[PDB]
């Protein structure tokens, strides 16, 4: 599994982990410092843009979501849920958003409490934050897992590490100036 040597590979796959392609684009990148989104708990996060042409990654995500659901059933039993009844992580950029960067892409909102490791093409840690930013292309490690919290339930996406591949045009961020400034009275 993963980057293991084929001869010495683990007996079982990690069914819930997916590493996205080199054509993955980062949106709303919060990998160097964590932030609160809509008053939520402060977390590292990124919206990972997966081209609709990346069938290998999409198929891997679909299989991982199913495996997450199955692992949730193995933990606590009961009947498998109807997928229309729960929150699922692979979102459609063409119909759920109105942003040009999202056209022709699926997206996943990945987050973690702890910081990701952010590395270059040679798998060395990146020592200049200006190399990774919203709009660049990077592989992202993702782990899918069952959850229930905040009035929602389904399958969530944990953010793992990030491997920068190539520059892209910078993307604008969320409208969060009120986190820095007060009304001047």
Neighbours of 71 (CB within 10 A): 15
What is the experimental resolution, given in Å to one decimal place? 1.3
DSSP structure string for 8-75: T--SS--TTEEE--TT-EEEEEEEEEEE-STTPPPEEEEEEEEETT-HHHHHHHHHHHHHHHHHHHHH
Method: X-ray
CA distance 114 to 108: 18
Judge residue 49's burial from the number of C-beta atoms within 10 Å of its C-beta, 0-12 exposed, 13-18 middle, 19 or more buried: buried
Q: Which residues on neighbouring strands pair with residue 87, listed in sequence order? A: 154
How are beta strands 118-119 and 137-149 bridged, if at all? unpaired
Range of the domain at 40: 1-185
Report the SS3 class of residue 95.
coil
Q: What are the CB-based long-range contacts (under 8 Å, 24+) for 88-93?
A: 88/154, 88/155, 89/61, 89/65, 89/144, 89/154, 89/155, 89/156, 89/157, 90/50, 90/58, 90/61, 90/62, 90/65, 93/49
CA distance 92 to 102: 8
Domain count, the chain: 1
CATH number at residue 126: 2.40.50.140
| Residues 111, 147 contacting (CB under 8 angstroms) | no
3-state secondary structure 99-130: CHHHCCEEEEEEEECCCCCEECCCCCECCCHH
CA distance 18 to 108: 12
CA distance 81 to 50: 26
């Amino acid at each position: 599994k993963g980057t293991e040597n084929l001869y010495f590979q683990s007996n079982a796959q990690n069914r819930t982990k997916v590493v996205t392609s080199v054509n993955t684009r980062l949106s709303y990148f919060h990998g160097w410092e964590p932030v609160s989104i809509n008053g939520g708990a402060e977390k590292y996060s990124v919206s990972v843009l997966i081209p609709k042409t990346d069938k290998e990654t999409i198929n891997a995500i679909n299989a991982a979501v199913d495996a997450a659901i199955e692992e949730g059933i193995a933990k606590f039993g009961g009947k498998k849920p109807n997928k229309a009844a729960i929150k699922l992580p692979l979102r459609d950029g063409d119909v759920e958003r109105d942003d040009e960067a999202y056209k022709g892409h699926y997206f996943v909102n990945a987050n973690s409490k702890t910081p990701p490791q952010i590395v270059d093409k040679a798998v060395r840690p990146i020592l200049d934050r200006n190399e990774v930013y919203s709009g660049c292309y990077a592989r992202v490690s993702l782990n899918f897992y069952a959850f229930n919290s905040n009035g929602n339930k389904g399958v969530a996406c944990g953010l793992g590490n990030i491997q920068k591949i190539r520059d892209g045009e910078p993307l604008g961020g969320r409208t969060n100036a009120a986190d820095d400034f007060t009304t001047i009275e």
